[PDB]
């Protein structure tokens, strides 16, 4: 399910025995209840851009 | 950077600045509060391992506005496989002395997973490339800092749509092409070991280094960068251990 459209995920995708897959996010993000979708946790999240953020 | 622009202030918060004796060496990329990835190759002439500085926070180099960060490299750590005054294995793994404070105009740019980056990334065409490099092949060196937005290409077609000239490097499995054969757009040896960062879903990721090509924008030739991805485990591993004594650090690769 990973290979095709990133699994559906925002971020990481794990593929797990059977039809699974998990999302999952890098550290300074948490995953959503849609189980795709990672929103910051910290005030400088990696790869995001304040400056523009803000706007 | 040729045929780019200024990046406006602040829109490329994790590019760091190297400097040797307070002269520009290379660019590098910020990946957490610590750590900084660069090119080994702009190493393969230091002396003065203890006169390393990393600026965070930087954009134009003839002021100081405050949101500069300066810290000293505690640790070089570079690729066992990697040769002096070669190509391949072209990634350096920087320890910061204190950690920079994150600001808005200070952060890391996101290390993605392999697969994540392999699978997904590798396959988002244009990506940013940046640095405070040659402004023009034989040219001076850039005062504000400068992006351009490059294509990557599949090596086959990168091999296909170059001019074959002798005494080429190869193109490894540890490389990619990005850029444009018609000598208009290009990174250049000043942005050597700067961000090639690619957005997918609003976050930016580091997929490349800028490291490598036959002369800055000449036609018929492609930037050459690090293919970030291969590299994903080890660089993990070591920000996962202790320092050791003496700031050049040569790790085992894979
Ligand atoms: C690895 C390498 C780098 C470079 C040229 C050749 C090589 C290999 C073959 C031999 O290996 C080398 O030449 N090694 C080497 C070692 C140290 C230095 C430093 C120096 O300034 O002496 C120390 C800090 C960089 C330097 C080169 C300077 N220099 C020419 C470089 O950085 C240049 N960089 C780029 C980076 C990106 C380029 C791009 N997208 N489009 C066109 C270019 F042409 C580009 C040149
Ligand atoms: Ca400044």
């Given at each position: 399910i990973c290979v095709n459209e990133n699994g559906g995920c925002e971020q990481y995708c794990s593929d797990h025995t059977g039809t699974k897959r998990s999302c999952r996010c890098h550290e300074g993000y948490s995953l959503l209840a849609d189980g795709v979708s990672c929103t910051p946790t910290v005030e400088y999240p990696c790869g995001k851009i304040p400056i523009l953020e803000k706007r | 950077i040729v045929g780019g622009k200024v990046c406006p202030k602040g829109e490329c918060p994790w590019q760091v600045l190297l400097l040797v004796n307070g002269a520009q060496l290379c660019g590098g990329t910020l990946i957490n509060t610590i750590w900084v990835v660069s090119a080994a190759?702009?190493?393969?002439?230091?002396?003065?391992?203890?006169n390393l500085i990393a600026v965070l926070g930087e954009h134009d180099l003839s002021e100081h506005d405050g949101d500069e960060q300066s810290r000293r490299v505690a640790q070089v750590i570079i690729p066992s496989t990697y040769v002096p005054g070669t190509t391949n294995h072209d990634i350096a793994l920087l320890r910061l002395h204190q950690p920079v404070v994150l600001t808005d105009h200070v952060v890391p740019l996101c290390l993605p997973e392999r697969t994540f980056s392999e699978r997904?990334?590798?396959?988002?065409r244009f990506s940013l490339v940046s640095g405070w490099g040659q402004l023009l092949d034989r040219g001076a060196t850039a005062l504000e800092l400068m992006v351009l937005n490059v294509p990557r290409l599949m090596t086959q077609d990168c091999l296909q749509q170059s001019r074959k000239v002798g005494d080429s490097p190869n193109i490894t499995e540890y490389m990619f092409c990005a850029g444009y054969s018609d000598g208009s757009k290009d990174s250049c040896k000043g942005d050597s070991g700067g961000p090639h960062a690619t957005h997918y879903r609003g976050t930016w990721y580091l997929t490349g280094i800028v490291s490598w090509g036959q002369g800055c924008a000449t036609v018929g030739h492609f930037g050459v960068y690090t293919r970030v991805s291969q590299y994903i485990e080890w660089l993990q591993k070591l920000m996962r251990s202790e320092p050791r004594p003496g700031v050049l650090l040569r790790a085992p690769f894979p």
């Open positions: - | 190759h702009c190493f393969d002439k230091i002396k003065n391992w203890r997904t990334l590798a396959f988002v």
